[PDB]
């Protein structure tokens, strides 16, 4: 029975196309209802529908049937990103927490913004800087420390600009994660690397300090709008779904046929 | 006499064409009737409406306007060549020969900086 | 040889066309086509683009040039942008204009930004990038994010406790703290406790309001894995992964 | 659809009455489709994006 | 630096507008577009009014150009309505209506701008560069 | 128009009916025909859609009026304005301006001076969709609903026009080939 | 190599008259001929094969054999392409061409073999629809028309 219905699916695939065969497969096996009933299968179903639409768009331009399978295997083997071949949103009615990078948050608007890793910084190793007089790009292939410092200054300015862009998108409330992060491999050397970050340059005023010095610099600028609290690790309960019964629905049945046997034929159509 | 019939929809114009056909009949029975159309689909729709109105839609030609203009050029004026000498590809192949001959002229000083810098006969074509 | 072209090849070909002798007259033809220019997002300006704009619209009469931008938003230095081109453009031009009013955020967040970024002089560490105290809007002065108790402040710097910590442990602890704050905002939001108030109007905080701003994809996956453990679904709007790799 | 001019054609510099233009032809095609509708007109367009749910604007004619 | 008024900006030479984060930059571009369409400013105005095919707006992101085109079209329609009604609910639109003495010619120019907004010159960087290469192909030496 | 000496030549021409044999003038008011045309030669059309959309129609009717031996006969069937689409076609055909701008405060405050639109009028409908596949799916569902609602509606009188036929016809063939036997309409 | 036999076969075809009075094809002028006339025939009733084949068999003598074909109810338009319509001495005539003829090589193509080919290939319905189309066209074109 499985081989017979798959041969029927192959006949639909050769006669009707890609999307009718996939729609008959999703309707006969009822896999879409099982994916919607499964927790986490809605993203999988939207990915299946997008892959089906891309396969229909690629098979409408291809004559052969194995050519579409070869195209799908080639696009599996080629992970290159186009404008149409990217992942879409899974659902729009259900509200979801939107994670967005700093470059993708430029010009947008968000009510509540959380910045957990704004203290994490990266030290640039390559010596590619700009001259402070001619304003031209200078690439130093030799390992000179002056070019490394002049590139690290531009890296710190880029991190400060990223900090400003990430801070100026909140409307009602923004939360920051501050910690005495040490990039150096030493455990307790008496100094921390928060002055090497973008956030610590505004808190410690560009001066190297310690963890207690960072705490006093945080507690120094305390206003009605700026407050601080400790990070306490603790979990009590995940969430409450607060479900409600779904509203009833039925599909309408077509009473009359949409059209009669209307066709413009010839003598060969009647023979 | 040139007659232009202003109407809002095409059904009144089809009724006017039906009235003109039923009023004035052709002298020759095998003389074709030229109906100028915008496309093949409008010609098929007009043939459908004429078959629904008359009961028969035969011996009615639906020529395109440039094809009808060339047919009138053939019928009115004799000794006309079937293909024009001023074809698009023909003018391109003539200009590909004539443009290097006119590079020495003073009026083509703009194309000389465009063509004589580097050319594998790609910019010229 | 193939006769193809690229995105940067258009800029390079226009710069090479303006670099020639007759192409300056071509720039005059551009002065016959558009005798004005309003250029948005001037922080993302290549040096070739600024060389083209300087060759076309430097000091010719009847044409105007309006470079609208922000030096504090030049974050595309990996792509090819450069803030030193903006500093050269600032040194070349004479007039400077700034906007005073801010129409997006609450005045508490504006005061927090003007308190944090105006601690010292030239906080962006460049002499040609000055910071000014911006002003909030009068129509949005009553924006308040209220919790079950007192009014929540604008900026809340969660200080992680400890002397010295690594990268991964700090990321995991701050991801768990952020997930706990998200579930506390969503648990108290569905009972009418945590609200967004504009004047007298109130709105409950849904799951689409809270957004986590990360920098990379690995820490975004860390936030998503720390948030899906507490039965909270989350979407990644910056996900540029292809569907054919799943 | 809007088509850029070649740049050195004299018809684009000086237009006349009987000149072919893709913009005016489509703007008259929309008017002819509005007039030719007898009973029901069903205009559908992409108003929202499916990728990032961004707002998409319709045509100037609609 | 100096503060910026959208109705007192001199449109002569090179000007540098520093719009901060969260400010109405997309509103300021539409205000300057409405200023350039009707020719407002008095002594600091343009010497002649320009059409829609002479105002060049350059924005890198294509969706940003589409959003800016829609916002400029909406501002053109709102200013046309406010000029036909001689009243508005916006203070910047109120000062824009107070700067002009004539109402019929400005409304006709805004109607022509609304009709020619389909042929507006709001392109990207690479789009404007490709249009300049394809337009004047002789001086550039392009295919 | 070109010249005031051409406006009188245009005013001398009238359209006689093909069946009823009654002459009608070209304009609504012949005395205000000089006031309708501007000094540059462009007529201020009261309908904004006809003025902004029919420039090819303007050039074609100008070149048709420029002919010397032309015989113009008019056969116009008036449309009774009951629906929204018939209201739009009547406002286009009768050459009138129904766009209420509200030049005074009395025109702006009161709102019953416009035309009433019934909520059951499904003549002109605008549908916002998210995907082109979803767009043609909602199109097929609405066409099936219109075929079920109107019994005297043959499928040959339905036309679907797509601006971009290259990016929609795969989706059209997909959602029109995937119909069951009780839902399949020919395409 | 087929060309000098083809031209003499063509001139042998054109010299042979095909009429009850003996009218050849060379007597037809350019105004008298109409080659490949396309017609669209309307039909509003559901075309039932059982109600049509009995009406055909009532008058057509070639329908003695030929059991009836099966086709669905066709409502709408029927396309047709007549090969040649030509008038002569005030009388119209229809002419069609068939050229398959694979199974015959000797002189056995008599009237009985051609009638068997007409019954096998079912050209009787095509010829009857051609007569109906020509009757409707001559009724619409020429006023006071008699069949």
Swiss-Prot record, chain D:
Phenotype upon gene inactivation: Decreased degradation of DNA with free ends that is unable to undergo homologous recombination, which can fortuitously lead to more efficient viral infection. Cells are deficient in DNA recombination repair and have increased sensitivity to UV light. The cultures have many inviable cells. Cells can be transformed with retron Ec48-containing plasmids.
Result after altering residue 19 to A/H: Acts at variant Chi sequences
Domain of life: Bacteria
Free-text note regarding domains: The holoenzyme may undergo conformational shifts upon DNA binding: the nuclease domain of RecB may swing away from the DNA exit tunnel in RecC. When Chi DNA binds to the RecC tunnel, the nuclease domain may then swing back to its original position (that seen in crystal structures), allowing it to nick the DNA 3' of the Chi site and then rotate to load RecA. At high Mg(2+) the nuclease domain may swing back more frequently, explaining differences seen in assays performed at high Mg(2+).
Family (UniProt): Belongs to the RecC family.
Subunit structure: Heterotrimer of RecB, RecC and RecD. All subunits contribute to DNA-binding. Interacts with YgbT (Cas1). (Microbial infection) Lambda virus GamS protein interacts with the enzyme without displacing any of the subunits.
Extra remark: In the RecBCD complex, RecB has a slow 3'-5' helicase, an exonuclease activity and loads RecA onto ssDNA, RecD has a fast 5'-3' helicase activity while RecC stimulates the ATPase and processivity of the RecB helicase and contributes to recognition of the Chi site.
Its biological purpose: A helicase/nuclease that prepares dsDNA breaks (DSB) for recombinational DNA repair. Binds to DSBs and unwinds DNA via a rapid (>1 kb/second) and highly processive (>30 kb) ATP-dependent bidirectional helicase. Unwinds dsDNA until it encounters a Chi (crossover hotspot instigator, 5'-GCTGGTGG-3') sequence from the 3' direction. Cuts ssDNA a few nucleotides 3' to Chi site, by nicking one strand or switching the strand degraded (depending on the reaction conditions). The properties and activities of the enzyme are changed at Chi.
Protein name: RecBCD enzyme subunit RecC
Species of the source: Escherichia coli (strain K12)
Gene (name only): recC
From Swiss-Prot, chain F:
Gene deletion effect: Decreased degradation of DNA with free ends that is unable to undergo homologous recombination, which can fortuitously lead to more efficient viral infection. Cells are deficient in DNA recombination repair and have increased sensitivity to UV light. The cultures have many inviable cells. Cells can be transformed with retron Ec48-containing plasmids.
Biological function: A helicase/nuclease that prepares dsDNA breaks (DSB) for recombinational DNA repair. Binds to DSBs and unwinds DNA via a rapid (>1 kb/second) and highly processive (>30 kb) ATP-dependent bidirectional helicase. Unwinds dsDNA until it encounters a Chi (crossover hotspot instigator, 5'-GCTGGTGG-3') sequence from the 3' direction. Cuts ssDNA a few nucleotides 3' to Chi site, by nicking one strand or switching the strand degraded (depending on the reaction conditions). The properties and activities of the enzyme are changed at Chi.
Assembly description: Heterotrimer of RecB, RecC and RecD. All subunits contribute to DNA-binding. Interacts with YgbT (Cas1).
Entry similarity comment: Belongs to the RecC family.
Note: In the RecBCD complex, RecB has a slow 3'-5' helicase, an exonuclease activity and loads RecA onto ssDNA, RecD has a fast 5'-3' helicase activity while RecC stimulates the ATPase and processivity of the RecB helicase and contributes to recognition of the Chi site.
Domain-related comment: The holoenzyme may undergo conformational shifts upon DNA binding: the nuclease domain of RecB may swing away from the DNA exit tunnel in RecC. When Chi DNA binds to the RecC tunnel, the nuclease domain may then swing back to its original position (that seen in crystal structures), allowing it to nick the DNA 3' of the Chi site and then rotate to load RecA. At high Mg(2+) the nuclease domain may swing back more frequently, explaining differences seen in assays performed at high Mg(2+).
Name by which UniProt lists this protein: RecBCD enzyme subunit RecC
Source organism (scientific name): Escherichia coli (strain K12)
Parent-protein residues present: 251 to 437 of 1122
């Amino acid at each position: 029975v499985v081989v017979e219905e798959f041969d029927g699916y192959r006949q639909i695939w050769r006669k009707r196309g890609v999307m009718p065969m996939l729609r008959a497969l999703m309707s006969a096996r009822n896999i879409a209802e099982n994916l919607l009933a499964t927790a986490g299968g809605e993203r999988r179903l939207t990915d299946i529908l997008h892959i089906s639409e891309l396969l229909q768009e690629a098979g409408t331009q291809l004559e052969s049937e194995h050519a579409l399978v070869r195209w799908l295997s080639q696009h599996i083997l080629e992970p290159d990103s186009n404008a149409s071949s990217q992942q879409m949103r899974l659902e729009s009615d259900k509200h979801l927490v939107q994670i967005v990078t700093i470059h993708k948050s430029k010009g947008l608007e968000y009510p509540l913004v959380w910045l957990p890793f704004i203290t994490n910084f990266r030290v640039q190793e390559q010596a590619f800087y700009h001259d402070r007089h001619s304003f031209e790009a200078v690439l130093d292939l030799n390992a000179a420390p002056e070019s490394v410092d002049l590139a690290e200054a531009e890296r710190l300015a880029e991190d400060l600009r990223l900090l400003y862009v990430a801070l100026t998108r909140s409307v009602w409330h923004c939360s920051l994660g501050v910690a005495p992060l040490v990039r150096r491999r030493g455990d307790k050397k008496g100094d921390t690397d928060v002055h090497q970050s973008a956030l610590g340059r505004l808190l410690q005023k560009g001066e190297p300090q310690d963890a207690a010095g960072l705490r006093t610099c945080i507690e120094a600028l305390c206003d009605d709008d700026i407050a601080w609290q400790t990070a306490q690790t603790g979990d009590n309960q995940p969430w409450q779904v607060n479900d409600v019964s779904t509203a009833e629905l039925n599909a309408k049945t077509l009473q009359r046929l949409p059209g009669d046997n209307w066709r413009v034929t010839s003598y060969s159509g009647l023979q | 006499m040139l007659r232009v019939y202003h109407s809002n929809r095409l059904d009144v114009l089809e009724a006017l064409m039906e009235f003109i056909v039923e009023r004035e009949r052709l002298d020759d029975p095998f003389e074709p009737e030229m109906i100028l159309v915008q496309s093949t689909g409008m010609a098929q729709w007009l043939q459908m409406t004429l078959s629904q109105k008359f009961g028969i839609a035969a011996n009615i030609d639906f020529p395109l306007p440039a094809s009808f203009i060339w047919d009138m050029f053939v019928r009115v004026l004799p000794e006309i060549p079937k293909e024009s000498a001023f074809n698009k590809q023909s003018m391109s192949w003539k200009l590909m020969t004539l443009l290097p001959q006119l590079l020495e002229r003073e009026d083509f000083t703009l194309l000389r900086h465009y063509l004589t810098d580097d050319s594998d006969k790609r910019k010229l074509f | 040889r193939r006769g193809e072209l690229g995105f940067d090849d258009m800029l390079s070909r226009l710069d090479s066309a303006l670099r020639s002798e007759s192409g300056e007259v071509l720039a005059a033809a551009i002065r016959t086509r558009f005798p004005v220019a309003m250029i948005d997002e001037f922080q993302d300006t290549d040096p070739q683009q600024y060389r083209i704009f300087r060759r076309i619209w430097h000091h010719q009469p009847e044409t105007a040039l309006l470079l609208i931008g922000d030096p504090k938003q030049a974050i595309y230095a990996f792509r090819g942008a450069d803030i030193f081109t903006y500093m050269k453009a600032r040194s070349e031009v004479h007039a400077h204009y700034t906007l005073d009013t801010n129409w997006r955020s609450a005045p508490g967040m504006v005061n927090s930004v003007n308190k944090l970024f105006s601690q010292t002089d030239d906080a962006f560490m460049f002499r040609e990038i000055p910071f000014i105290p911006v002003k909030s809007a009068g129509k949005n002065q009553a924006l308040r994010f209220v919790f079950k108790g007192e009014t929540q402040p604008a900026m809340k710097m969660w200080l992680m406790e400890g002397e010295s910590c690594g990268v991964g442990d700090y990321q995991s602890t701050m991801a768990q703290v952020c997930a706990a704050q998200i579930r506390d905002w969503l648990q108290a939001g569905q009972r009418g406790e945590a609200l967004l108030m504009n004047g007298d109007d109130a709105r409950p905080v849904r799951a689409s309001d809270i957004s986590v701003l990360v920098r990379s994809r690995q820490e975004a996956a860390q936030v998503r894995d720390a948030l899906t453990l507490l039965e909270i679904p989350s979407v990644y709007l910056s996900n540029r992964d292809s569907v054919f790799e799943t | 659809r809007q088509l850029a001019p070649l740049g050195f054609d004299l018809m684009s510099q000086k237009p006349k009455r009987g000149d072919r233009s893709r913009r005016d032809d489509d703007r008259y095609l929309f008017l002819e489709a509005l007039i030719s509708a007898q009973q029901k007109l069903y205009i559908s367009y992409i108003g929202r994006s499916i990728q990032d749910n961004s707002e998409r604007f319709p045509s100037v004619l609609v | 630096a100096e503060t910026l008024d959208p109705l007192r900006l001199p449109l002569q030479g090179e000007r540098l507008i520093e719009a901060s984060a969260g400010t109405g930059k997309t509103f300021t571009i539409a205000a300057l577009y409405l200023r350039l369409l009707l020719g407002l400013g008095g002594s600091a105005a343009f010497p002649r009014p320009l059409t829609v095919e002479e105002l060049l707006v350059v924005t890198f992101t294509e969706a940003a150009t589409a959003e800016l085109r829609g916002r400029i079209r909406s501002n053109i329609h709102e200013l046309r309505i406010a000029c036909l009604r001689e009243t508005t609910d916006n203070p910047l639109y109120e000062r824009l209506l107070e700067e002009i003495d004539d109402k019929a010619q400005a409304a006709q120019w805004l109607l022509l701008a609304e009709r020619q907004m389909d042929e507006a010159a709001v392109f990207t960087i690479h789009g404007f560069c490709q249009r300049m290469l394809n337009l004047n192909a002789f001086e550039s030496g392009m295919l | 128009i070109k010249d005031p000496a051409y406006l009188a030549k245009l005013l001398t021409r009238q359209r006689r009916h093909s069946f009823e044999d009654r002459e009608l003038p070209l304009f609504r008011d012949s005395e205000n025909a000089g006031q309708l045309f501007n000094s540059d030669g462009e007529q201020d059309v009261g309908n904004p859609l006809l003025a902004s959309w029919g420039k090819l129609g303007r050039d074609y009717i100008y070149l048709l009026s420029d002919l010397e031996s032309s015989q113009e006969l008019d056969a116009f069937v008036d449309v009774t304005p009951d629906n929204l689409l018939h209201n739009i076609q009547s406002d286009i055909l009768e050459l009138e301006n129904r766009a209420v701008a509200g030049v005074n405060i009395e025109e702006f405050s009161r709102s019953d001076n416009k035309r009433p639109l019934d909520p059951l009028d499904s003549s002109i409908t605008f549908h916002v969709c998210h995907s082109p596949q979803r767009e043609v799916e909602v199109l097929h569902d609405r066409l099936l609903a219109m075929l079920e609602e109107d019994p005297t509606l043959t499928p040959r009188d339905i036309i679907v026009m797509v601006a971009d036929i290259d990016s929609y016809s795969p989706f059209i063939q997909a959602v029109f080939g995937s119909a069951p036997a009780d839902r399949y309409l020919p395409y | 190599q087929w060309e000098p036999v083809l031209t003499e076969w063509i001139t042998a075809v054109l010299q042979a008259p095909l009429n009850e009075t003996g009218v050849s094809l060379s007597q037809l002028s350019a105004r008298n001929k109409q080659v490949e006339m396309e017609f669209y025939l309307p039909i509003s009733e559901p075309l039932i094969a059982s109600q049509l084949d009995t009406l055909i068999r009532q008058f057509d003598p070639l329908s003695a054999g030929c059991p009836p074909l099966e086709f669905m109810q066709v409502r709408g338009m029927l396309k047709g392409f007549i090969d040649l319509v030509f008038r002569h001495e005030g009388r119209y005539y229809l002419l069609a061409y068939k050229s398959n003829w694979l199974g015959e090589d000797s002189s056995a193509y008599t009237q009985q073999a051609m009638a068997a080919a007409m019954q096998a290939h079912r050209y009787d319905l095509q010829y009857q629809l051609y007569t109906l189309a020509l009757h409707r066209y001559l009724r619409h074109r020429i006023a006071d028309y008699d069949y």
